């Protein structure tokens, strides 16, 4: 009896009311009523995501796009899902694409995309990073076991030394007691092989090295009278595609007022020149 346009509104009220499983089911009746409407699917897709079930959302997006391959939201959400499924490559791609469309269609979300985009780039890198081998070392592999050895000679050759004088309760603490003595002795070591000119140290890219708009590494940093540093290429268009105001302080800014942050370029250059990765990031 209720119209699809009414069922959507209903779900809209629920979703705002955080009743995600209920709103989603509400969009489902509006879809059976009229499949040919992209909004429904993308909306329901957002319910599934909030309901932590990319399985469904992924499918529902793969339908909203069949009725609108130019859907910014559909692409954004689709990419989102892929993140959960851990398809880091595709995910960042659809976000990338969902970003261009949004820019193209002259839509405005701000951060919402470059942010999640930058986030998906970070969560991706995190993967192949913990996937590296680092390759122990000649002296390492050696001393590494020398300790594990000295440990057995105690826990398994000095613990049962007094099965009576030290029952379960006693040496159960006398066990981890020495274990920590060795887990640390070695701990100090690890830091040695890491600070010893070794690249085995976690490789990540700072934040103060990215733009306040692009949310990515800057190649032509320049600051404003306010003091915020953006990439000359991003606040370039924002000045001729959104207005004449600082995208942060919202101050009356104008293109011929941008100062080149030379000291920054330096810092950014030096970074790259030292970090092999990146470009792969």
């Amino acid at each position: 009896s209720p119209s699809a346009q009414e069922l959507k509104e209903q779900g809209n009220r629920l979703f705002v009311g955080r009743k995600y499983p209920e709103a989603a089911a509400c969009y489902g009746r509006a879809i059976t009523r009229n499949p040919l409407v992209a909004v429904y699917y993308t909306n329901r897709a957002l319910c599934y995501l909030k309901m932590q079930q990319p399985e469904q959302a992924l499918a529902d997006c793969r339908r909203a796009l069949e009725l609108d391959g130019q859907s910014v939201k559909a692409h954004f959400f689709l990419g989102q899902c892929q993140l959960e499924m851990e398809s880091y490559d595709e995910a960042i791609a659809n976000l990338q694409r969902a970003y261009s469309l949004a820019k193209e269609q002259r839509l405005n979300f701000g951060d919402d995309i470059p942010s999640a985009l930058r986030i998906a780039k970070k969560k991706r890198w995190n993967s192949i990073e913990e996937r590296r081998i680092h390759q122990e070392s000649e002296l390492h592999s050696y001393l590494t076991r020398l300790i594990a050895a000295e440990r057995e000679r105690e826990l398994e050759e000095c613990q049962r030394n007094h099965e009576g004088h030290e029952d379960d309760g006693h040496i159960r603490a006398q066990q981890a007691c020495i274990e920590a003595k060795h887990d640390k002795y070695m701990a100090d070591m690890d830091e040695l092989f890491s600070q010893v000119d070794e690249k085995r140290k976690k490789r990540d890219i700072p934040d103060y090295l990215c733009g306040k708009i692009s949310f990515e590494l800057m190649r032509e940093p320049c600051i404003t009278p306010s003091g915020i540093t953006y990439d000359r290429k991003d606040i370039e268009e924002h000045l001729q595609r959104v207005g004449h105001f600082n995208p942060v302080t919202r101050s009356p800014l104008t293109q011929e007022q941008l100062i080149p942050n030379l000291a920054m370029k330096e810092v950014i250059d030096a970074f790259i020149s030292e970090n092999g990765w990146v470009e792969d990031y």
């Binding site: 319910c47 939201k73 405005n108 979300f109 919402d112």
Partner: peptide, 9 residues
Amino acid sequence: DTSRMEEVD
């Protein structure tokens, strides 16, 4: 006063 994406319109 823009508009976010994590919103069902």
